Structures are given as C-alpha cells and as structure tokens.
C-alpha cells in the first residue's frame, strides 16, 4: 500500500508488454503465450530479459499439471499429454519425472499401464521434525520482536519525543 | 420434471426439460435466461447425484445424465476445480471418489504460512522505517 | 498360604515323600512361586541321589520356562495336565515380563499351540488366575499386558535390580537439577527485565524534569 | 470384597466434626455419622459425609432414625445422585459398641461399610479403616464380624488443587514448578530407599527376604511404561498441536510491540 | 465366562419347574448365560471376529452377530460392529490415558513396596536409612 | 395408501437396523427388509438426502459406511479463525506506517 | 567432506589469483566440483566467466563442460557416455571418478522414489549398467523383478524443558 | 492454641451484633478467613456442578474487622425467596442440634470461565441482602479457571450502599473478561469492593493432610492436564480472535488500546498450554526415558 504513486501513474503505462504477457499467463494456453512472446521479441530482447520470459513459459506447463492433480487420481500419460498440450506420452512422462525429481509435484508413474498417479500427501505433523521447525521459526519471531522492542525504547528516551 | 428432480430420476427429468426447451425458447420474458437457467438446474442435479455416494461408477452416472463418459468426465472436472463437488476422479476405472480433507494438516500449512508472510512484512517494514528515518528519496 | 503350609509340612521329611510333596507342590493351584520351598536344605539334598531329576524339575518350574521343558524332557519325569497347564502359564508370565505387547506368533511357538482358539483359552485362563492383567487384540493378533507378577530370583539377578534402581535415581536426579535450573533462569529474566523497564522510567523523566527549566 | 474409593474431603469432614465437638464440650468426645456416595458395579466410591444425630441410654447408642431420614430427603433435595453408603466414627479399633451401632445401621442399608479414624495416633501412615461387616455361625450362634477392605484415594483436578492449597497455605514457572518438584522429591526418596534395601540384601545385612526382592524384580520390569509407536505418534501429536499454540501467541505479541513502535516513530517522524 | 458343561450341570442339579422356556424355545437361562458371557468376554478382547465369538459362546456366527448386535442397540454394551471385517470392537482404550494409568499403578507399586519394607522389618534399613537421607 | 404405510414401515425398521453397525452390506439389508438390492438402494438414498441416515453408499463394492467416527474438531476451526484475524491485523498494523 | 575443503580451496584461488584470470588446473578442478555438487548454475556460470583464452589452450575443458552439458540436460546415458571420454593426470580423476558413482546414487534413488513399474531396459539405461546385471543386481533388496514381460517393481523407500521456559519467559515478559 | 478459633461464644456474637460498629463505617469489613473444609466443600460443589452455576449459603461468624467462615451448604436451586429460604430454615434448624452453632454470615455461588467478579444482579442480591441481614459477604468461584491455572479463583466482595461515592482508590487486578460480559463488568465496578482472603485449618487437620501427602504424590505425578481442559482452551481461543477482530477495527478507524487486552489474553491462554505441556514433558522424562 505504501507505495509512490509514480509507479501506478507513470511507470506502469511503459510496461505495456509485460501486462499483456500476464493477461496471457492469467489464461492457460500455452500457445497464446508463445504467440505473444514471439509477437513482442524485440521488445523483451532489447531490455535483455530474454530467458526470464523462456522460463515463464516452461512454468506455465508445469503449473497446468500441478492444476491436474487438485481434480484428477490416476490419468493415462497420452491423457495428460492432451490437457496440458505436451504433443506425446514421452514428453509428458519426462515432465512429470523432472517434477518429481524437484518436488513439485506428488506422483508415481507406471510404465506397465502407462498412468500416472497423484497422491498429495506432503506430510503428517507428528514427527519432532516439524517440532524443530516450529521452534526455528519461533525463535526468530523472538528475535524480530527483541529487535522491535530495542528500537522503541531507543525512540521513547529521545528529548524530541519528549515535547510531544 | 419438479417431482422427477425431487424423486432422484434425472434421465426423465432432463429429457423432459430437453423437450420443452424448444417450445420455451419462443417465450418473451423467459427465452433470455433459458440456457443460464438449464446449465443451473443441470448442475444441480450432479451435486444431488453425487451426495449420497463415497465413491460412484461414472458408467452408471453418465447413463443417468444421458451424456457419454468424457463428456461427463469433462463436466465433472469443471465442477471439481470451482464449484461443490468435493472429489477425485480415478480415470483408469472411471470412478468418481468423495475427497474428505484434512483439518489439522490443513490448519498447520495455514498457520505457517501466515507466520512467513508476517515476518516478510515486519522485514520490509522495519526497513521502510530505516529509509524514512533516513530521508531517502529520488528527486 | 499354601507354600506356607508346605514348608511347615515338610520340615524332616526326605526321599520318596519329598518327591510326593514336590508333585503336590507343582500341580497345586494358586501358587505360582516356588523360591521358599527350593532354598530349604532337605530340598536341595536331593542333588545327590537318585532323585536329581526332582530336584531339576523344581528349578525348570522355578525359573525355567516350557520350551526348556521340550530339549530337556527326557531326563525329568512325566508331567501331569495341571503341571503342563502351569508351566505354560508361567512361561506366558516369562514373556509378558520383557516385553508387554506380545505377538500371537510368539505365544504359539512358545506354548506348543495348534489353533488361536486354544492359545486364547489358555490366556483367559491365565488371566482369571490373576497372575497377568491384560488384554487381547485379534486383528493385531497382540495380547497387551498391563501387570505381571514376578517369578523367583537367583543369586546372580540383584545385579540387574540395583543397576535399575540406580538408573532410575539417577533420572530423578537429573531432572530434578535441571527444574531447579530452569526456575533460577526464570526468575533472574523477570528480575532483569523489571530492573531495565525501571531504568528506562527513570532516564525519561530525568529527561522530562530538565526540558522543564 | 468390594473395592472403596475414599475423598479427602470425606477426612476433612470427620476431623472438623471431631475438633468442634471437643472444642464445644470441653474433652475428646467420639462422633458417629454418615456417608454418602456411589457405587458402579463392585466399586464403592465415598464422596462426602453428614453428621448424625444420637443418643445414649444405660451404656448403649441408639441411632435417631427420624432426624436420619430428614436429613436424607434434605442431601436428596440436592445431591440427586448421591446415595447413602454408610457411617463413620472416630476412634480406635472396631469395639462390640461399633457391632451394636452397625446392627441398628444394618436395618437402613443391606451392606453398609464402617470407616473408622483415629484422632490420637503416633504412626505415620492415615489412620482411616474401612471395614465390611461379615455374618458367621459360631457354636451354632450366629455373630457379626469387621473385614477389612483396602481403600484408595481418588482422582479428581480441582480436589487435588483445593488439597494442596490447604496443605501448602504459603514468576509463573517457578510458581508451576514447586508442584512437581515436591513429587519428585518423594519417588526419589522412595526410589533410594528401596534402591539401598535391596544392595543391603545383596551384600549382607539384613534376613533374605524373598517376597520384597520378587516385588523389587517386578517393579524394574515395569520400565519403561507405555513405549509402544502409537504412544509416540500421540505425544508428539500433542507436542506440535502446542507448538502451533506457542506460535501464534510469539506472533500476537510481536503484531502488538510493532504497532506500539509504529505509533512511536509517528509521532516522533511525521507531522499528520 | 461360563463355559458349557458348568451350565450343563447347573441345568442337571435344577428341578423341572425352575426351567422356564418359550413355547418356541429360548430357554430364558441359556440366553442370560449367553448375554452374561458376551458381557464379560467384552472385558478381556479389545476386538474379536464373529466365528471366534460364535466359538466363545459356542453358538453360530450368525446368531453371534445378532445378539451383539441386540446388545450393542439397547445401550447394554459399548462398542461397534464391522460388518465387511466381520469384526466387534469393543472399548477403544486411548494411549495417553493409559499412560496416566500406568504411572499410576507403578507409583502404587513402589508406595506398597516402601510399606512393606518399614513394616516388616523396621530399625535396620527402613528407619536407619530414612534418617541418614535426612541428615 | 398401501405403499406408503409399506414405505414408513421399512423406513424404521432400516433405521433402527443401522444402529449398532459401522460398515454394513447392502444386500444384508435386502435380506432383511426383504427387497431387492436396488430398491434398497433408492430407499437408501432417499433417507441419506434427507438428513435421517448419516452415512454414505459405496457404490462400487455395494455397502453403507455410517458416519459414527468424529472426534474434537473445534480446536482446529478456533486456530484458523486466530490465524485469519492475525493475518488481517498484522496486514492493519504494518500499513499504518506510511 | 575431502571434497568440499578442496572446493573451498579452488574457489578461494580462483578468487584471489594473479590479477583475475586462475591457472587452467584450478579452472578444471572447479569446473568439475561443481558438477560434483549438482551446482549447475555455478558450474554455467564459471564457464561462462572462464577466458576462450584458456578454453582454446586447454582442451579438457571442452570435455568436462560436455559432461556437464549432458548433466544439465538429465540424460543419464549421456552422462555415462560422455564420463568415461577424457582423463588428467590425478588431478580431475578421483572426482571425477566420485561423478559417476554419485550419479549412480541419484538415478537409484530417482527410480525408486518416482515409479512403481520400470522396465528393465529402461532401468538398465537410467543406472548404466547392462541389462542382466541391473536384474540380478537388485537381489537382497527384492525388488520383485519379472520374466517375460522384463518388468521391474520398485520398492519404495534435556533442551525442551529449557526451550519451554524460555518461551514461557519471552511471553509473560 | 490454633483451635481456639473454632470455639463459639454466643454471648459475644450478641454483643457484637447489637452493638454493630458497620452501621457508621462503609469500608469497615476489609478480612475474610475461610475454613479449609469449606473452602474444599465450594470447590468440589462448584465442580460437580459442571459448566453451569450453584449458589449455597455460607455459616460463620465476626471477629473485629474479619469475616470468618466456617461452613457451608448447596441450596437447591433445581430461587431467590421460598424454596430457597424453606430450605435455609430446615437446614439451620437441622444442623443447631448436632453441634453446628454458627448462623449464616454470607451465600457463595460459582462463575464458571468469566472470572470472579459480581454483575448487576449480584450487585442488587447483595445489597438486598445487606439492607435486612448484616454483616454479610458474597463469595464468588470460578471452578474452570481453578483447574487452568493451578490456583484456587475465589473472590469475597461486600457492596457498597446505594448512592455512596467511594473516592477512586480502586486497585483492580487485570481480569480476562468474555466479550459478552465485558460491558456487565464496566457499568458495576465500583458498587462493590473486594476483601482479602486467608484461609486456617485446625490441628488434626494439618497432621491428617501432611499423613495424607504420603500417598496423595501419585496424582499429582499423574495429572495431565492438557487432556482435562480442551473445550476451555477452545472458548479462549474463540473470544480472543474476536477480541482480536475488534482490536483491528479500532485500528483501522482513527476499552483504551484494545490490542494490548486482546494481547494479555493471548499470552495467558499461551502460557497455561506451555504449562501443561512441559508437566508432560516432566512425566516422559521420568517414566518413559528409563529405557533399559
Ligand atoms: C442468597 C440468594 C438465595 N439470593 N438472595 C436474594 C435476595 F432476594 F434475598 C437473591 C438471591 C439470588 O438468588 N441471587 C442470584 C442472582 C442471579 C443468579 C444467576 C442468574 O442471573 C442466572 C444465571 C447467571 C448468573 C450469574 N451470576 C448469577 N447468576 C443467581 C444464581 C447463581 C448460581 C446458580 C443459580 C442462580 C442468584
Ligand atoms: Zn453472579
């Protein structure tokens, strides 16, 4: 909220492409976004964010397939290679192990019936593992309020926040 | 087709609102909301099919929707992502499963988030305070 | 007491009448410890003889279990069907002893049982004579004990009582420092923090009195 | 044999019923009352008590069943649940003037229990007994006896609070850990002394005593207590679930201490 | 548990007017044995299949799960029936308070064992080493 | 009127059977009602609609699971209610500056 | 832990260096610790940053950054392909040595966690070794393999009381 | 002499009352001193109660500027006057034959989970009670908190008279208030004034306590108090997020500092699971960590 106001007046207007290239990343189609960024090549290549865009449009593949595991169990490879538009049951098998293999996703592939299965469970809270992370976190919710409560009592000791 | 709706028989139901959708179209003050009103009544009916049931044959379903099994599959994935049907569909046997959730993990994952994202602002803010304190601006 | 009444009752008597009393002693119901009655002289005279086998028989029952009495049954005599039942009752007290949550597995390699059904019997008999406490679970296939008494002792097993005991007072010990510990630290916070609020108060308003001249 | 559960507040109301008395008339006088309670199945449970009204005549108490039965609709009209049980008194051990007054007692409640307390004692244990009257034929004569039962103490939170408030009568965790400390205190005491009996037994000082070494060796058995995985899975079910609690309480004091510094800066960095 | 030949004694000991049946059977003193037997075989299994209740009982699977069944509808029992598992389960017994209730027992044990020691043998060890821990 | 006072009658006495039991086959209860398995499970589904049954239909190994496992779920719904408001006032609290 | 220190080393002398530009063995040994590591961001990095200088002087870092192409790519025959290609004089071999069996670690583990029915051709391809020995291999871990089809199943793999006190002290102030 | 103060003197008490010095004085009774049996009978009437509110009557006796109780009895309440004042008579009558001589000094009743505090109703009962029969004393339990925090919650207070004007003076400890009893507890607050209580027992009771101590540890080693109070932990929690809804609000526009309320309630709530977490803690360590 705390923001200027030049950036919401005169700075977006300059951005108009990358606006666009969202509205396009809002809807998922793989292939308008492609369309786009091909149609606004010289734009994003002369401020040389060129490859930060390459990258949003391999993500927008892998947050399809992350969108087919909140309604789908057990999907057939050339079944997945259809909704998210991978052109092939290879290259959706090789999506969905380079997902796994960086632990987006939650999924078992089997190669006998060619499906693949979603099983969404990241982690039970029974272990002294999340208990060593509560007590991480905890600690440094503490030390961000001792910090906060050093600077007050450094701020009510000032003659200038004396007189008022 | 109100009493067919309320005894559970959707096959008649909709065919018989299937048949009287041409004549209605012909309406003066109900022709415009025609279709609107159709897809809401129709998707009713899912959710009153799938109520009782933990986990239901989608052969079954699809006979009683008159529709075939993609398309229902299809209808019942756009259900599934927005709207009251809380399940998963298991397309190598074709079988719609009721989803129970998880309160406790869920409020776990909730809660640690919210604690991330307030110590990401007391960040930003206690470095907004350092800037102002400062005076720091472009001119 | 019956082991009372046996001890009282065999206070001269040897030979064959000793080995009478001991088949009495083993096939009596409701004594399950026989420590008084192995300890005593007339007892264990019988090592020289002809009535050893008695003698062997008494420390099996004593402190032995039954799958002892299975490589070792030739030397001792016939067991009755109240001696049997009593072994394998203190063998299922042997078992529940080291581990309080005993697999069905075990218990039928132990007792020599066919069925489930026999093994369960011969629990719910235990259980009745009151030597275990304890439940069963038939789809974990589990006999979950909650008490068991303790069977006789020898010379060379107050080792393990006192090293037990020791490691129990040295727990208590421990955490009794480390409460004691942490009420010190607690204490000395709420001390501090009162003494920096209370120095802070007094440098505002020496502050506040010398802008008020 | 049942088994009797007993209420502290049940001794309290014995001990202030005798001290009132003796203060009142001037010397140690023995009182005679009630009690109630429950009982579910064979287990009797002793809540609480009311004093009875007596008399003596010749050299014998005879018990006013009228003021009995006043007093029973009275505790009906409050304690719906509650039911009578049987009486107390206040003295030594059983006497044939306590086999008269359970025979007249006898005539309100088929099984009544008979607790005793001793006002005057020098031994270091409770001096509450709890005895069951027991019919038996004797040369043909049929006599009453006293059978003594083993009572326990019952659990209840806010008796176990109002108790030690009593008992003791004069930060936050170190107020919390005074109550622990002063039971650990006692298992440790208990541990060590029946950790050196036995090593006396081991090396020699004292007689062999076979029945305190079998109930030594099933006491060890008994550790550790409950370490099954389901256990585990509990304990740290409750571990996180107060971890979570201790989380968001750091959080409200930290959104609290930066709103008060925000107000400060504010109003020391800014003009409105 | 009553087994049957203890009831097929008991039965042989009473006279004739004592044995109150239906006009279409169910002897009023087998089916309370029966019931007094699935009460107290509910104190000893955590859990039991029906052919091993019906064995217990020494009645048929079948009239094993109607009975427990009739039991469990009227309030006289506390648990659930498992139809597909064919598994009655009785009281759950939660882990944390049995953990409570163990502690308890085994402080018992130690306060019972302290007792007897003093009061079987005292001077010697019991008041000696109370006081040496004192001073 | 006949079919209605048939309909009543199986109603209760499907009811009361559903007591005890915590997973229970359909065709069980076609033997006990003496119906056929699909009207059993149209009556089935008829009281589930309307609020009198608590539980739901297996369909496709036919039986009827009650819902009769609950536990002390408040203490999870009053953490998301503190978490939201947490969320909402520490949101208040650091806009306040600028 | 032989083989950070080393890491350390490298990149300190890197860092330091005679005005900027390292010798080729230290560029070499980086290069291939980086790829050790699974650093592949790094290891682009300082190929990209190393002077064609030293590209064209030095030959082997053609062939390490081809091992390295192939490790960014995920294709596991390329890996082994391209491994047992090219050697140095005791300076590159122990870790490059240790590439191949932390390569073989993580195309187990890959295997394991991320497939419920493999064929063995394909296990065979994504381990390296060769079809009989990859079946046979896989014997007291018992992973179920099968004949005929050739299909292979993979199995799938004190301070609290101070903490709380200090909790409890932070709160009540 | 401990005991003497359970000797009764009726020619005093006559004196006194007829010679009454809290008719010139309003802040005369400033004592109380509660029996330990009727402290223990309150608490174990008030927790059988459950979650809903018994009111008894409480005997005693005056001594200077103290209010001494000694006894106590449930009414039955299934009512003000009739049932309630019926059963009073019958039980004072009752009880003056068996050697309880003491007449009525003040009613208790419990205030389960809001505190200790007296509402407007309180306020009118006391002072209706202090207009015909005095002295008198209102005792008010919370039978939940007790249980929480490990500390009896008991609280005597004595009203002050209608249209009386005390001069400030008013320490008034912080008290963790429901929202829907929060505006009861501002309009009267300073119609009533708290005294300081203490507690005695006699001699036999303290030798009874301390032989009962020997076997009492168990149950204190065997508490678990994080499993006793769970519906407790869950209305706290409720009330401080509404708290906390409310704090925000008065936030966003622009009690005093509403946060810092909404803040103290939090920590408490906190604190008191810490507690009954690290008891657990304590309990594991003992037992379970023996691991032979
Ligand atoms: C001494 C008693 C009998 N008494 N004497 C006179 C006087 F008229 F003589 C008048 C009275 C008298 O009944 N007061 C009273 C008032 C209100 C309540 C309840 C009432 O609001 C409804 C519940 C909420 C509540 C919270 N706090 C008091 N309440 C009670 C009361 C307390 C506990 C149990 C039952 C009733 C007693
Ligand atoms: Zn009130």
């Known amino acids: ?164 | 087709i109100i009493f067919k709706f309320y005894e559970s028989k959707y096959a008649s139901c909709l065919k018989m609102l299937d048949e009287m959708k041409d004549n209605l179209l012909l309406d003066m003050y109900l022709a415009p909301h025609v279709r609107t009103l159709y897809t809401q009544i129709r998707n009713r009916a899912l959710i009153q099919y799938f109520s009782p049931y933990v986990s239901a044959d989608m052969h079954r379903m699809a006979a009683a929707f008159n529709t075939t099994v993609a398309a229902l599959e299809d209808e019942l994935t756009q259900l599934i992502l927005e709207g009251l049907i809380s399940a998963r569909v298991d397309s190598h046997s074709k079988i719609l499963y009721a989803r129970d959730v998880d309160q406790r993990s869920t409020t776990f994952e909730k809660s640690l988030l919210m604690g991330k994202e307030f110590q990401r602002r007391a960040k930003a803010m206690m470095l907004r305070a350092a800037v102002l304190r400062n005076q720091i601006h472009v001119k | 007491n019956l082991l009372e009444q046996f001890i009282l009752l065999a206070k001269g008597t040897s030979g064959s009448a000793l080995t009478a009393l001991i088949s009495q002693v083993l096939e009596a119901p409701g004594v399950y410890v026989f420590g008084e009655l192995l300890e005593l002289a007339n007892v264990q005279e019988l090592a020289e003889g002809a009535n050893a086998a008695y003698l062997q028989l008494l420390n099996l029952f004593a402190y032995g279990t039954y799958p002892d009495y299975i490589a070792n049954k030739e030397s001792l005599p016939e067991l009755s069907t109240a001696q049997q039942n009593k072994l394998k009752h203190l063998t299922i007290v042997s078992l529940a002893s080291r581990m309080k949550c005993i697999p069905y597995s075990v218990l039928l390699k132990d007792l020599e049982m066919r069925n489930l059904r026999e093994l369960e019997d011969l629990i719910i008999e235990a259980v009745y004579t009151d030597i275990i406490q304890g439940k069963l679970d038939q789809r974990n296939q589990l006999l979950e004990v909650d008490f068991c008494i303790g069977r006789d002792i020898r010379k060379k097993d107050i080792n393990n009582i006192v090293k037990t005991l020791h490691e129990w007072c040295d727990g208590c010990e421990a955490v009794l420092l480390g409460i004691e510990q942490q009420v010190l630290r607690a204490n000395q916070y709420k001390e501090n923090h009162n003494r920096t609020q209370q120095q802070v108060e007094a440098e505002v308003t020496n502050i506040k009195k010398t802008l008020k001249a | 044999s049942v088994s009797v559960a007993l209420h502290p507040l049940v001794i309290l109301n014995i001990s202030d019923h005798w001290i009132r008395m003796r203060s009142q008339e001037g010397r140690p006088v023995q009182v005679i009352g009630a009690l109630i309670g429950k009982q579910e199945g064979r287990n009797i449970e002793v809540m609480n008590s009311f004093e009875l009204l007596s008399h003596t005549v010749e050299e014998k108490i005879i018990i006013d069943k009228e003021y009995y039965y006043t007093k029973e609709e009275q505790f009906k009209q409050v304690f719906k649940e509650l039911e009578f049980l049987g009486w107390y008194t206040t003295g030594g051990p059983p006497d044939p003037s306590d086999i008269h007054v359970h025979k007249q007692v006898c005539e309100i409640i088929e099984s009544p229990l008979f607790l005793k307390l001793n006002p005057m004692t020098k031994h270091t244990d409770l001096p509450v007994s709890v005895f069951e009257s027991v019919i038996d034929i004797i040369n043909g004569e049929a006599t009453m006896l006293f059978a003594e039962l083993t009572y326990t103490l019952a659990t209840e939170e806010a008796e176990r609070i109002g108790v030690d408030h009593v008992a003791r009568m004069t930060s936050t965790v170190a107020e919390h850990l005074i109550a622990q400390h002063s039971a650990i205190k006692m298992l440790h005491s208990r541990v060590k002394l029946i950790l050196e009996y036995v090593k006396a037994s081991e090396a020699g000082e004292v007689p062999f005593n076979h029945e305190i070494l079998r109930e030594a060796y099933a006491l060890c058995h008994c550790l550790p207590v409950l370490s099954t995985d389901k256990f585990k899975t509990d304990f740290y079910d409750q571990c996180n679930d107060v971890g979570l609690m201790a989380y968001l309480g750091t959080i409200t004091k930290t959104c609290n201490t930066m709103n008060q510094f925000v107000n400060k800066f504010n109003v020391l960095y800014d003009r409105q | 548990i009553i087994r049957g030949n203890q009831l097929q004694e008991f039965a042989a000991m009473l006279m004739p007017h004592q044995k109150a049946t239906t006009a279409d059977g169910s002897s009023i003193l087998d089916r309370a044995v029966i019931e007094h037997n699935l009460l107290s075989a509910s104190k000893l299994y955590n859990n039991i299949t029906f052919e091993e209740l019906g064995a217990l009982l020494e009645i048929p699977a079948a009239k094993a799960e109607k009975i427990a069944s009739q039991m469990i509808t009227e309030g006289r029992m506390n648990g659930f029936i498992d139809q597909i598992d064919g598994i009655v389960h009785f009281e759950t017994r939660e882990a944390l308070p049995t953990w409570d209730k163990q502690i308890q027992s085994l402080c018992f044990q130690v306060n019972n064992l302290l007792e007897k020691i003093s009061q079987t043998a005292p001077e010697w060890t019991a008041q000696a080493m109370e006081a040496q821990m004192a001073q | ?98 | ?173 | 002499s401990i005991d003497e103060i359970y000797k009764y003197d009726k020619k005093q008490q006559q004196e006194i009352l007829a010679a009454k010095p809290w008719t010139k004085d309003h802040h005369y009774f400033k004592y109380c001193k509660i029996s330990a049996l009727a402290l223990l009978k309150m608490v174990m009437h008030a927790r059988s109660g459950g979650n809903l509110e018994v009111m008894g009557l409480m005997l005693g006796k005056v001594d200077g500027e103290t209010m001494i109780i000694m006894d106590s009895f449930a009414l039955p309440v299934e009512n003000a006057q009739a049932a309630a004042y019926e059963y009073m008579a019958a039980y004072i009558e009752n009880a003056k034959q068996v050697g309880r001589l003491e007449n009525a000094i003040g009613w208790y009743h419990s205030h389960p989970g809001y505190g200790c505090w007296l509402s407007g109703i309180d306020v009118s009962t006391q002072m209706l009670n202090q207009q015909f029969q005095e002295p008198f004393v209102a005792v008010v339990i919370d039978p939940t908190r007790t249980i929480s925090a490990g500390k009896v919650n008991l609280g005597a207070f004595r009203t002050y008279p209608k249209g009386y004007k005390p001069p400030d003076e008013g320490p008034s400890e912080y008290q963790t208030i429901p929202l829907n009893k929060i505006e009861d507890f501002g309009v009267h607050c300073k119609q009533y004034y708290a005294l300081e209580v203490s507690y005695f027992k006699s001699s036999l009771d303290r030798k009874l306590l301390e032989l009962l101590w020997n076997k009492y540890w168990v149950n204190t080693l065997s508490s678990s108090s994080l499993l006793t109070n769970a519906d407790y932990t869950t209305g706290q929690v409720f009330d401080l997020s509404e708290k906390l809804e409310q704090s925000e609000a008065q936030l966003g526009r622009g009690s005093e500092d509403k946060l810092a309320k909404a803040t103290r309630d939090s920590c408490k709530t906190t604190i008191e699971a810490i507690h009954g977490l690290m008891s657990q803690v304590i309990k594991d360590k003992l037992f379970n960590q023996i691991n032979i």
Not at chain 1, 97 to 125: C, R, T, W
């Open chain 6, 1 to 98: 009127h006949i079919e209605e006072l048939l309909r009543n009658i199986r109603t209760q006495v499907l009811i009361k059977l559903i007591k005890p039991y915590t997973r229970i086959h359909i065709p069980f209860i076609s033997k006990e009602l003496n119906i056929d398995v699909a009207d059993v499970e149209s009556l089935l589904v008829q009281c589930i609609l309307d609020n009198t049954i608590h539980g739901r239909i297996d369909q496709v190994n036919q039986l009827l699971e009650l819902d009769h496992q609950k536990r002390g779920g408040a203490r999870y719904t009053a953490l998301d209610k503190w978490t939201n408001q947490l969320n909402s006032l520490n949101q208040a609290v650091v806009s306040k500056l600028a």
């Open chain 7, 1 to 173: 832990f032989s083989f950070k220190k080393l890491l350390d080393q490298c990149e300190n002398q890197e860092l330091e260096a005679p005005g900027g530009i390292a010798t080729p063995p230290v560029y070499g040994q980086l290069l291939a610790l980086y790829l050790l590591h699974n650093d592949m961001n790094n290891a682009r990095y300082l190929w990209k940053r190393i002077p064609p200088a030293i590209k064209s002087a030095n030959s082997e870092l053609g062939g390490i950054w081809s091992v390295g192409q192939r490790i960014w790519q995920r294709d596991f025959p390329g890996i082994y392909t391209t491994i047992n290609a090219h050697q140095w004089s005791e300076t590159v071999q122990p870790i490059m040595e240790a590439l191949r069996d932390a390569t073989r670690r993580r195309a187990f583990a890959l295997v394991s966690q991320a497939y419920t029915s493999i064929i063995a051709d394909d296990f065979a391809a994504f381990v390296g070794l060769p079809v009989e020995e990859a079946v046979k291999g896989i014997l007291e871990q018992g992973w179920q393999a099968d004949s005929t089809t050739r299909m292979v199943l993979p199995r799938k793999p004190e301070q609290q009381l101070a903490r709380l006190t200090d909790y409890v002290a932070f709160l009540e102030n």
């Open chain 1, 1 to 164: 909220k705390y923001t200027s106001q030049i950036v919401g007046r005169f700075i977006k207007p300059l951005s108009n492409a990358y606006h666009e290239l969202a509205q396009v990343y809002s809807t998922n189609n793989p292939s308008e976004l492609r369309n786009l960024v091909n149609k606004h090549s010289e734009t994003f290549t002369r401020d040389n964010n060129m490859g930060l865009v390459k990258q949003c449009l391999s993500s927008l593949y892998k947050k399809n397939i992350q969108r087919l595991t909140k309604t789908f169990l057990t999907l057939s490879l050339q079944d997945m290679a259809s909704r998210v538009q991978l052109s092939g049951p290879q290259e959706a098998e090789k999506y969905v192990l380079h997902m796994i293999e960086d632990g987006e996703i939650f999924a078992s592939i089997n190669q006998k019936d060619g499906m693949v299965s979603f099983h969404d469970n990241p982690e039970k809270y029974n272990n002294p593992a999340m208990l060593h992370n509560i007590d991480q976190e905890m600690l440094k919710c503490i030390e961000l309020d001792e910090r906060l409560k050093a600077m007050d009592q450094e701020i009510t000791v000032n003659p200038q926040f004396v007189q008022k």
